[PDB]
């Protein structure tokens, strides 16, 4: 039977995330699994605020760094192992990809 | 610190066999990583290693308030005699060669 599988992809790097996502989608359908297509989730902006000045005299100067984590999921439905197998191969560095047994 | 030369030999043997030994630095700590001499702040493990170090035999790298002991060639020879175990027993380095 078909099994509902959720592929979560998490990263911070648009271009890398995007062309990993590409490869998963394209290779999925190529030897037949569900296509779906990406559910983009809101990018989360982690904001850290610090004093720019060690030892505070002068003027109030503040520095704010952000780090933008990006999340997307894709729900494929098709059979068990050959899903998570054909997907998770052909990638090694720098974009997290999680294949989850979640969803019935 | 203080403590017998039964604790000291235990530490030295573990350094010899692994080829690494580690401690961490805090005075509010209770307990160094890699077994230690067990719920105590910075001391016994560090001091046994420090004594060993003074006479050569181990190279210490410090960074991010942690002590990485890296076993030296001369140290492999010294501990081999001190432990008095057969004259090759393989100290966990030389292993695979590139």
């Amino acid at each position: 039977a078909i099994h509902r599988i959720r592929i979560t992809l998490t990263s911070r790097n648009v271009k890398s995330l995007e062309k990993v996502c590409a490869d998963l989608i394209r290779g999925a359908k190529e030897k037949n699994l569900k296509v779906k297509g990406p559910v983009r989730m809101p990018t989360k902006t982690l904001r850290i605020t610090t004093r720019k000045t060690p030892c505070g005299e002068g003027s109030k100067t503040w520095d704010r760094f952000q780090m933008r984590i990006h999340k997307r999921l894709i729900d494929l439905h098709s059979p068990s192992e050959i899903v998570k197998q054909i997907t998770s191969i052909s990638i090694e560095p720098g974009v997290e990809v999680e294949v989850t047994i979640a969803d019935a | 610190m203080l403590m017998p030369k039964k604790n000291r030999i235990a530490i030295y043997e573990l350094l010899f066999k692994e080829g690494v030994m580690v401690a961490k630095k805090d005075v509010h700590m209770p307990k160094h990583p890699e077994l230690a001499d067990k719920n105590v702040p910075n001391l016994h493990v560090m001091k046994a290693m420090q004594s060993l170090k003074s006479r050569g035999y181990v190279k210490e790298q410090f960074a991010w308030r942690h002590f990485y002991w890296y076993l030296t060639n001369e140290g492999i020879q010294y501990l081999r005699d001190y432990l008095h175990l057969p004259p090759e027993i393989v100290p966990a380095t030389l292993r695979r060669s590139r």
Partner: protein, 53 residues
Amino acid sequence: QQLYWSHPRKFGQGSRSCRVCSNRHGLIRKYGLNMCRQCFRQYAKDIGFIKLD
């Protein structure tokens, strides 16, 4: 002949410090960083934090 040399701390800023030095005031505990701000400035490149705004 130690009898006491620690005392329980889990209270205020005095119970934690930077993970490369000992420091107080402005200790980032958010995201499990556990570094003082002054140190964090020099390592802000290495965590992945970046300024654009």
